[PDB]
Amino acid sequence: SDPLLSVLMWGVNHSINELSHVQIPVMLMPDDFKAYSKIKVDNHLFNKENMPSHFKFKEYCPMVFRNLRERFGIDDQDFQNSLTRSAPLPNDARFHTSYDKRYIIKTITSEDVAEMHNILKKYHQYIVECHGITLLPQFLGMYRLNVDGVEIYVIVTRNVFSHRLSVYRKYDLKGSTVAREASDKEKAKELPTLKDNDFINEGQKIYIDDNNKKVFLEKLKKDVEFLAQLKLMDYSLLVGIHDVERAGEFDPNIDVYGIKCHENSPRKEVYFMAIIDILTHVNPEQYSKRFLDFIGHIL
Amino acid sequence: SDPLLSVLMWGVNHSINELSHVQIPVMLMPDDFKAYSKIKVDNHLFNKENMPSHFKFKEYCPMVFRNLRERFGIDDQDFQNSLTRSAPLPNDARFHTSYDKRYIIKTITSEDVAEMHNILKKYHQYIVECHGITLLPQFLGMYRLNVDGVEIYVIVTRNVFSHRLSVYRKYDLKGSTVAREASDKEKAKELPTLKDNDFINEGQKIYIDDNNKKVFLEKLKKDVEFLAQLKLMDYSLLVGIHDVERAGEFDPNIDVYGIKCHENSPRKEVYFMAIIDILTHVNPEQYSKRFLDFIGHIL
Ligand SMILES: CC[C@@H]1C(=O)N(C)c2cnc(Nc3ccc(C(=O)NC4CCN(C)CC4)cc3OC)nc2N1C1CCCC1
Ligand SMILES: CC[C@@H]1C(=O)N(C)c2cnc(Nc3ccc(C(=O)NC4CCN(C)CC4)cc3OC)nc2N1C1CCCC1
């Protein structure tokens, strides 16, 4: 056990238990976007084996994230279990993934937390309008952890990749002018992280039918315009391919970002694509177009 | 809902959930008697309907009371349910009783808390030696509650009376020289609180067989010597009678203080007797003898 993780599991557990008692209305009030719950814990000569002795836990806008979870088809108990039944696994910007591979837990700066607060209402409204059908990150919770001296902020999102089906290739696409190539140290890992020019060079094709491709690009258009209108940029399209003839039917209700290949595909492939890395604030305007140009071409 | 109660239920719930994860050894260490766990909670614009916005909860020596509960045959989950499933009921020195009538919850002074800390180790050792078979109060938990401005201390004990069988008469016996009579305002309540001279005047007899009477007085002797040796005094014998031919078999494993009447008793009676009010610190020495003289006579 690493203390900051134990506090997170402890905290998510506590937070979801509290909410289970709250009466949940259909609507959020404007105050729900300014809300939080803090808990400070001090154990003197008690419970040394599991928890640290002195820790704080803060949940931002618990009602908003409760409402978002349900809008994204996530039940609070399942969300609880996925984060609590067993520890989240590391990858060390480092991230953790829930033991069941459903959720990602990433450390963010206080600046990112400030930007999240800044866009949360508009983000929530967007999710309402598109009925939760989007390629944007699905934000599920946001927390502050303190363990004697160290303060960190985390956000929780839905995993873009599958919780069963492995992924043998991964891309990260921005469609920028500034030459985007991968480095060689990455290449030597179980799954590297290829970039723009690796794609427009290793002759990578995505075999999805002309309907699936139409829906996707329509979504992508709306999402990216929303991102641009908030003056956000430097986001990527995360692309991940699962070869069936290596490890292939999936659950579209769990692996919500999956798209099957069309019938004429050279190999049985499942694609996982969504937008990631949205919280940084040449400009945002053309970045969106430049992003849309690129993806329209490569797909 | 009265806020201080909600905090207590909340707090007992939280505390028992924490312990459920702790590995419980057979032995307590000396540090366990100096231990505690504090939790401070701040909700900003959140959860107004159930909890107060700002409260603190402190549990003293959680390991000791965990150990005592089990020694008194109380399971932590049942204890939890009894205090949490529905609110405790008032009687307003005021007290509350769990909704299932199993437990008493009384407010105490910081001075009482200090005295409890002072005697807890010796008290625990006494419970070990008598294998939990005693007429002393069964202390099950001790807490501090804060709700914005107001700080209170509570202790939890097992109810001397039954959780089913009603009680139509109640005495409170010290066996003092100083004339002990009841007042008339008490008499007009559903169950008054009669005192020494009400007993040695209304010709009250306790019809228990000569064996039951032998065991009881032996216990009483040991208990009271223990109390005296801690320089404690001003405790009473709480006596409560249940007439079967008004409202009578009981569970000796729940109503642990009950004694059936012998076969020749004029009416079918069940007696509930135990020591109460021990935490005040002419002297303690003879008070014990004086107490023992009286009870030997009246029983
Ligand atoms: C909130 C961060 C952001 C985001 O916005 N969302 C929505 C997101 C959703 N899902 C994922 N999923 C994964 C993305 C990359 C990897 C990956 O690179 N895995 C390798 C596997 C082999 N080896 C152990 C080394 C690492 C694994 C993922 O989950 C299995 N990542 C997301 N990211 C990324 C993660 C942190 C920065 C970008
Ligand atoms: C920790 C306080 C102390 C103690 O040490 N123990 C062990 C204790 C264990 N059990 C009890 N039980 C009851 C004792 C008295 C009464 C009683 O007087 N009830 C009336 C009933 C009708 N009406 C609503 C008005 C009040 C009810 C009890 O439980 C049903 N009391 C105890 N007391 C006493 C309680 C506070 C001071 C003395």
Strands B150-158, B139-147: pairing is: antiparallel
CB–CB contact A22 B62 (8 Å)? no
How far A10 CA sits from the closest chain B CA (Å)? Answer: 10
Task: Determine the straight-line distance between the first and last CA of chain A, rounded to whole angstroms.
Answer: 43
A264 touches B at CB < 8 Å: no
A38 touches B at CB < 8 Å: yes
Span from the CA of A64 to the centroid of ligand 1 (angstroms)? 24
| Rounded Cα–Cα distance for residues A234 and B105 (Å) | 59
CB B61 within 8 A of CB B32: yes
- What's the order of all strands across the beta sheet hosting A258-260? A169-173, A236-243, A269-276, A258-260
Backbone angles phi, psi at A260, to 5 degrees: -65, 150
Q: Which residues pair with B106 in a beta bridge?
A: B95, B155
A32 touches B at CB < 8 Å: yes
Amino acid identity, residue A26? V
Name the residue with the closest Cα to ligand 1, atom 24. A91
| Rounded Cα–Cα distance for residues B121 and B118 (Å) | 8
For A184, A210, B24, the CA distances from A2, given in Å and listed in that order, are 31, 48, 23
| Rounded Cα–Cα distance for residues A103 and B75 (Å) | 36
CB atoms within 10 A of CB B85: 11
| Rounded Cα–Cα distance for residues A23 and A85 (Å) | 26
Strands B236-243, B169-173: pairing is: antiparallel
**Residue tagged 């030997």 (tokens):** B296
For A54, A143, A146, A263, the CA distances from A150, given in Å and listed in that order, are 11, 14, 6, 53
Q: Is A212 helix (H, G, I), strand (E, B) or coil?
A: helix
Q: Where are the beta strands (DSSP E) in chain B?
A: 36-44, 54-60, 95-97, 103-108, 139-147, 150-158, 169-173, 236-243, 258-260, 269-276
Amino acid identity, residue A243? D
For A206, B89, B105, B225, B276, the CA distances from B233, given in Å and listed in that order, are 86, 29, 21, 11, 11
| Rounded Cα–Cα distance for residues B100 and B88 (Å) | 9
B188: tokens are 């007009």
Amino acid identity, residue B187? K
| Rounded Cα–Cα distance for residues B50 and B48 (Å) | 6
A11: tokens are 């905290």
For residue B160, what is the DSSP state? S
Q: Which CATH superfamily is domain A3-158 in?
A: Phosphatidylinositol Phosphate Kinase II Beta (3.30.800.10)
For residue A46, what is the DSSP state? S
| Rounded Cα–Cα distance for residues B88 and B98 (Å) | 4
Residues 62-91 of A with CB under 8 A from B: 62-63
CB A191 within 8 A of CB A43: no
For residue A36, what is the DSSP state? E
* Neighboring chain A residues of B32 at a CB cutoff of 8 Å: 45
C-alpha dihedral (A222, A228, A234, A238), degrees to nearest 10: -10
CB A171 within 8 A of CB A100: no
| Rounded Cα–Cα distance for residues A259 and A78 (Å) | 24
C-alpha dihedral (A113, A114, A118, A124), degrees to nearest 10: 10
| Rounded Cα–Cα distance for residues B240 and B161 (Å) | 7
| Rounded Cα–Cα distance for residues B78 and B65 (Å) | 15
Q: Which of B107, B211, B81, B101 is nearest to B158 (CA)?
A: B101
Experimental method: X-ray
For A180, A186, A237, B150, the CA distances from A224, given in Å and listed in that order, are 20, 28, 11, 52
CB A143 within 8 A of CB A57: yes
Q: At what angle do helices B62-71 and B76-84 cross, to 10 degrees?
A: 100
Q: Where are the beta strands (DSSP E) in B83-201?
A: 95-97, 103-108, 139-147, 150-158, 169-173
Which positions of B are catalytic? 106, 234
| Rounded Cα–Cα distance for residues B37 and B144 (Å) | 10
For residue B89, what is the DSSP state? B
CB A143 within 8 A of CB A60: yes
Burial B6-44 (b: 16+ CB within 10 A, else e): bbbbbbbebbbebbeebeeeeebeeebbbbbbbbbbebe
**Residue tagged 């002297």 (tokens):** B283
CB B291 within 8 A of CB B223: no
Q: Which residues pair with A238 in a beta bridge?
A: A172, A274
| Rounded Cα–Cα distance for residues A45 and B222 (Å) | 33
**Burial class of residue A255, CB neighbours in 10 A (0-12, 13-18, 19+):** buried
**Burial class of residue B138, CB neighbours in 10 A (0-12, 13-18, 19+):** buried
Residues for chain B: how many in total?
299
CB A59 within 8 A of CB A69: no
| Rounded Cα–Cα distance for residues B67 and B89 (Å) | 27
**Burial class of residue A189, CB neighbours in 10 A (0-12, 13-18, 19+):** exposed
- What's the order of all strands across the beta sheet hosting A54-60? A95-97, A103-108, A150-158, A139-147, A54-60, A36-44, B36-44, B54-60, B139-147, B150-158, B103-108, B95-97
Task: Calculate the CA B140 to chain-centre distance.
Answer: 8
For A191, A241, B164, the CA distances from A268, given in Å and listed in that order, are 19, 10, 69
Q: Resolution in angstroms, to 1 decimal, for this deposition?
A: 2.6
For A73, A157, A233, A235, A282, the CA distances from A222, given in Å and listed in that order, are 21, 20, 15, 15, 21
Q: Which of B296, B126, B116 is nearest to B216 (CA)?
A: B296
Backbone angles phi, psi at B130, to 5 degrees: -90, 10
3-state helix, strand, coil in chain B (%, to 5): 35, 25, 40
CB A33 within 8 A of CB A121: yes
Span from the CA of A5 to the centroid of ligand 1 (angstroms)? 18
Backbone angles phi, psi at A277, to 5 degrees: 65, 60
| Rounded Cα–Cα distance for residues B231 and B220 (Å) | 17
Q: HSE (CB half, 13 Å, CA atoms) of A96?
A: 22
C-alpha dihedral (B277, B105, A15, A81), degrees to nearest 10: 90
| Rounded Cα–Cα distance for residues A232 and A115 (Å) | 10
For A22, A207, A270, B92, B170, the CA distances from B236, given in Å and listed in that order, are 44, 86, 78, 21, 12
Q: Which of B252, B88, B286, B58 is nearest to B165 (CA)?
A: B252
Q: Which residues pair with A206 in a beta bridge?
A: none
For A45, the closest of B34, B43, B50 (CB atoms) is B34
Q: Which of left, alpha, beta for B52 (phi over 0: left; psi -120 to 50: alpha)? A: beta
Q: Is B208 helix (H, G, I), strand (E, B) or coil?
A: coil
B91: tokens are 């009687």
Q: At what angle do helices A76-84 and A62-71 cross, to 10 degrees?
A: 100
| Rounded Cα–Cα distance for residues A62 and A60 (Å) | 6
B265 touches A at CB < 8 Å: no
CB B22 within 8 A of CB B32: no
- What's the order of all strands across the beta sheet hosting B169-173? B169-173, B236-243, B269-276, B258-260
Cα torsion B67, B68, B73, B75: sign: negative
Q: At what angle do helices A62-71 and A3-21 cross, to 10 degrees?
A: 80
CB–CB contact B41 A46 (8 Å)? no
